[PDB]
Structure 1
């Protein structure tokens, strides 16, 4: 086969071996992609984690709140992949919201400065990364960001859901710019995945009530999904991101693909 054979793809967002971006990177290399990775603050830890990927991949530092990192990103990537080559895919899998904007801290008590940091990292940065990278992307390219369905409110996720609503809207504008380069921009809305942090939260890290509510949310997800949902398995989400990075959804942009077991299409 080789779904992504020959494609050069930048993958951001790996922080632990349970990160959804770690599985996206693994599956993309299994599929023939040549990768460049970006990591945020603990580069030594990230390098050690990505050593377990099937193939080597250069790791570049990128703090999306750092204008300088962003301004120099395209030059560093070109250096990593070689003059004359461009990227075919970009994976944005970054997100963050201060504790005051999630959990049991009341929705009305999150200070704007925390919300703003969260929106900067989780939403604005999708536009930041596309701005930095489209100049070095090939026609037929694909930009994919990680989302979760924020069309209805829900317990605990609070401001992070607002940040996803902003992100879905940013994606539709990025598609307009990306289109001028022959590039698609889309998001994958995933079901809940037991990442290290999510496990910490279910385990009570942000208050017992938030944990109980997240837990309830996960069970209802598998019940509602007509094909079921396994929160411990990120592979189905990684495969979907690879589908969008491939040439097999060439007429979809500014769009959202739901890799959630079909749960969002069922009331109960």
Structure 2
């Protein structure tokens, strides 16, 4: 197994189409022992993660809750056993209020909404690293999820801004994590048909926003030299496991693109 013997925390499962669900499944297939964290609907999340190939302890973590973060390391150590540390951490968390995405005009998003989205989607990457680095082994790996924000696009709006912030946060987290012998990187994935994404294409955030996201998805597969299957998160999950493994040992502060090569092609 690629991750045999490694102890890895995976955040961000909410449904069986969550990117983090497939990260967790592939990691377990590769021998990793997992600790899961979930937000708000913990009964639902437990029922979802019962379908993973192996049982895993589930801990509550709202990344806006300073008490959850202050206790997180101790709860993880209780789950994996005293004297054991984590080898990996997966941040697979995002949120932006509806005013910050969709046909809702970019200029009409109130800052309270934008600030909440940047808190959950970018600042919390630093929050989780702060909480967990003291219980991570040298040679460890922190990985977060990205959507390439280097160019503007329709509908993503303030979530794009939050991803630009996250990429910057990742480069500073790498500075801190390096003191522990730990790497920090992001995986920039192409579009994946999660439940939230399927709802947006169906028009949950306005019709023309849904139309624009559908055109974005089509252009992605067209641009990708090896194609892009938005219905299959496994290539993204394998890329996250590659970063969690010992096989990218000199990469940190960086972004790995699991997007079919689409960002390397103009058309």
TM-score bucket of the superposed structures, by smaller chain: over 0.9
**Residue 47 of structure 1: CA displacement?**
0.1
Q: What is the deviation of 1:254?
A: 0.2
What is the deviation of 1:130?
A: 0.1
Q: Give the length in aligned residue pairs.
A: 267
Shift of 1:251: 0.1
Normalised by the length of structure 2, the TM-score is 1.00
Q: What CA deviation, in whole Å up to 9, does each residue of 1:140-163 have, x standing for no partner?
A: 000000001000000000000000
Q: Equivalents in 1 of 2:155, 2:231: separation in Å?
A: 20
Distance 1:178 1:74 in 2: 16
* 1:50-85 deviation per Cα after TM superposition (whole angstroms, max 9, x unaligned): 000000000000000000000000000000000000
Q: Secondary structure at the match of 1:201?
A: helix
Question: 1:213 maps to which residue?
Answer: 212
1:121 Cα offset (Å): 0.0
The CA deviation at 1:119 is 0.1
Structure 1 stretches of 4+ moved >2 Å: none
Unaligned 5+ runs, structure 1:
none
Shift of 1:90: 0.1
Deviations 1:223-266 (A, max 9, x none): 00000000000000000000000000000000000000000000
Quote the offset at 1:206 in angstroms: 0.4
- Whether 1:244 aligns to 2:243 is yes
Instruction: Report Cα offsets for 1:179-227 as digits up to 9, x if no partner.
Output: 0000000000000000000000000000000000000000000000000
**Which deviations, in whole Å up to 9, do the C-alpha atoms of 1:100-136 show, x marking residues without a partner?**
0000000000000000000000000000000000000
Q: Which residue of 1 aligns with 2:132?
A: 133
Give the secondary-structure state (helix, strand or coil) at the position aligned to 1:247. Answer: coil
Distance 1:28 1:263 in 2: 25
- The alpha carbon displacement at 1:37 in A equals 0.1
Report the equivalent of 1:60: 59
Secondary structure of residue in 2 paired with 1:192: coil
Distance (Å, rounded) in 2 between the aligned partners of 1:50 and 1:191: 24
Task: Name the Cα RMSD after superposition.
Answer: 0.2
Structure 2 Cα separation of the partners of residues 151 and 18 of structure 1: 26
SS in structure 2 of the partner of residue 261 of structure 1:
coil
Distance 1:40 1:120 in 2: 15
